[PDB]
């Protein structure tokens, strides 16, 4: 059949967005250290609304990206607590789906009384071999039409691989 | 009272043409400019380093000095009373060759070739130009087709 | 208010309302279509036109008064919901006024007399249509009389002409009933869309 149309997870991005900066944000950074085995990166204050206590140039959220077998393992750990029920509204038109979970105690982490209670967003992006064209510098080119992931293809791949159930939104 | 300035009133003169913005084409740089050649001046808005004054836009002059990134041109600027031969140092981004000198060189080459070729044959060729002479008496042809009659159309709103 | 005698000719360049006026009184006209706007193109066959013969300026108040007169005569001639009038001319030139000494010689005579905007007029060229009315095939004399009544209210000299076109469209009346039968013109409310041949084949497959 298709020679090299096998779908594959390009990366898995975890993101923890807290309200205020300080000790809680530092702890939300420490939790990702043991969750992903790598140092996260801080994102801060794209704007200034002041309606809930943020300003310009203030550390707000932490995030990171995992690729490869570790990304697949983290996605499996997330779908474990998710129990493999995804809604129809979780999938985007491009083929990327995210679910989000509750506080990270259900992932299999030893609870620490000093860290606190934080969750993550757990956004997943799907890909195919050949999507690295739009990322290189020597020559840039669009993906195309028959190669880009569709809407139904993502949920079909999810049902085929992880045997999850798709609920109507 | 008219707010004299260096770039006053060039809103459409120093602007780039439509659908021609971006970086400068590289062909205008590789052109050769020697001393004594007749060139033209056209202000360009892509670069602002060595652009000439708004009064020399569209002026034709000969080159008297050449440097790394620019050329020196002697331009005949007509001041209120007389004409001054002014030396201007302008970069090569705003200068292009003048095809009038090229046409004159082609014509003089054709002339000195034609005379050198006709000297042996002894035919006094007329290589000197002239105005358009009045056309001679010619014979039109109707091939039996009657000339079509033309009538003015009545007025209609 | 100044009379219309002093704002008749075209003596200055167009001075429209923009970021440089920063102040202007509102216009007099607010509506341009007074008949039944939801009429189809096959409802009213003929159409008239008020074509100007003099290059001058027309005031928005004069346009308003003339269109009120035309509507008042038309709704009595052919009844309501049986016609469609349109004032094609739109006022955009803003005339300015220079109030003179608010009566004593204490204030300045002509020092800084650029003046403030007074109103809005409409510049009309020679041969430009002012108003146009479409009715049934038998309301020709009624449209002519309404346009004649509006002539007595418009300044200058403008004449009446019944165009050969079909309604408001740019197509003639003789080549309309045969070109609308087969798929070359599509009626869309008060207008007609002319479908060219240089399009994708799906637009042609959708028809026929």
């Amino acid at each position: 059949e298709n020679p090299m149309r096998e779908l594959r997870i390009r990366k898995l991005c975890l993101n923890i967005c807290v309200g205020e900066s300080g000790d809680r944000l530092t702890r939300a950074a420490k939790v990702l250290e043991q969750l992903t085995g790598q140092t996260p990166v801080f994102s801060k204050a794209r704007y200034t609304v002041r309606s809930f206590g943020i300003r310009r140039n203030e550390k707000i959220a932490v995030h990171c990206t995992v690729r490869g077998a570790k990304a697949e393992e983290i996605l499996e750990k997330g779908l474990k607590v998710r129990e493999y029920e995804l809604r129809k509204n979780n999938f985007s038109d491009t083929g990327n789906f995210g679910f989000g979970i509750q506080e990270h105690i259900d992932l299999g982490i030893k609870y620490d009384p000093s860290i606190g209670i934080y969750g993550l967003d757990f956004y997943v992006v799907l890909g195919r071999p050949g999507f690295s064209i739009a990322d290189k510098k020597r020559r840039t080119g669009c993906i195309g039409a028959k190669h880009r992931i569709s809407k139904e293809e993502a949920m079909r791949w999810f049902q085929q691989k992880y045997d999850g159930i798709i609920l109507p939104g | 009272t008219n707010t004299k300035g260096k770039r006053r009133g060039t809103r459409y003169m120093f602007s780039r043409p439509f659908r021609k913005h971006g970086v400068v084409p590289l062909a205008t740089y590789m052109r050769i400019y020697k001393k004594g050649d007749i060139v033209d001046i056209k202000g360009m808005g892509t670069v602002q380093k060595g652009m000439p004054h708004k009064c020399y836009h569209g002026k034709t002059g000969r080159v008297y000095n050449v440097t790394q990134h620019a050329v020196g041109i002697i331009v005949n600027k007509q001041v209120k009373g007389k004409i001054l031969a002014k030396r201007i140092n302008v970069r090569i981004e705003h200068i292009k060759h003048s095809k009038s000198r090229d046409s004159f060189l082609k014509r003089v080459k054709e002339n000195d070739q034609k005379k050198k070729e006709a000297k042996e044959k002894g035919t006094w060729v007329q290589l000197k130009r002239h105005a358009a002479p009045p056309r001679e008496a010619h014979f039109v042809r109707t091939n039996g087709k009657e000339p079509e009659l033309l009538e003015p159309i009545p007025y209609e709103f | 208010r100044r009379p219309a005698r002093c704002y008749r000719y075209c003596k200055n360049k167009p001075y429209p309302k923009s970021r440089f006026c920063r102040g202007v009184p509102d216009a007099k006209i607010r509506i341009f279509d007074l008949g039944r706007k939801k009429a189809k193109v096959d409802e009213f066959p003929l159409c008239g036109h008020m074509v100007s013969d003099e290059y001058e300026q027309l005031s928005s108040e004069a346009l308003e008064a003339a269109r009120i007169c035309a509507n008042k005569y038309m709704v009595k001639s052919c009844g309501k919901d049986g016609f469609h009038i349109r004032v094609r001319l739109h006022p955009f030139h803003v005339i300015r006024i220079n109030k003179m000494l608010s009566a004593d010689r204490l204030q300045t005579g002509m020092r800084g007399a650029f003046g403030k905007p007074q109103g809005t007029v409409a510049r009309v060229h020679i041969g430009q249509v002012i108003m146009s009315i479409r009715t049934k095939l038998q309301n020709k004399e009624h449209v002519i009389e309404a346009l004649r009544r509006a002539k007595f209210k418009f300044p200058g000299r403008q004449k009446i002409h019944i165009s050969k076109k079909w309604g408001f469209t740019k197509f003639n009346a003789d080549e309309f009933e045969d070109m609308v039968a087969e798929k070359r013109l599509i009626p869309d409310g008060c207008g007609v869309k002319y479908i060219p041949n240089r399009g994708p084949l799906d637009k042609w497959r959708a028809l026929h």
Binding site: - | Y64, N65, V66, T67, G72, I74, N76, Q78, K80, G81, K82, I83, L84, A85, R87, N89 | -
Partner: protein, 68 residues
Amino acid sequence: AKSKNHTTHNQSRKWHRNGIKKPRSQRYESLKGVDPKFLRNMRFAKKHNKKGLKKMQANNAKAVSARA
């Protein structure tokens, strides 16, 4: 006492009375504004020319005179 501000009326006549003739074009116009390095090189080439000119050019002139 307001007066006239600025006009250019009756100026082209004053100019054309004397003439708007072009400047005097003469051979060897000037050497000002030319690159100083180029001017130095030209001076050196002009002052070192007579060193080798008066012999080799004379020999070549004798040769071409013998040729024709």
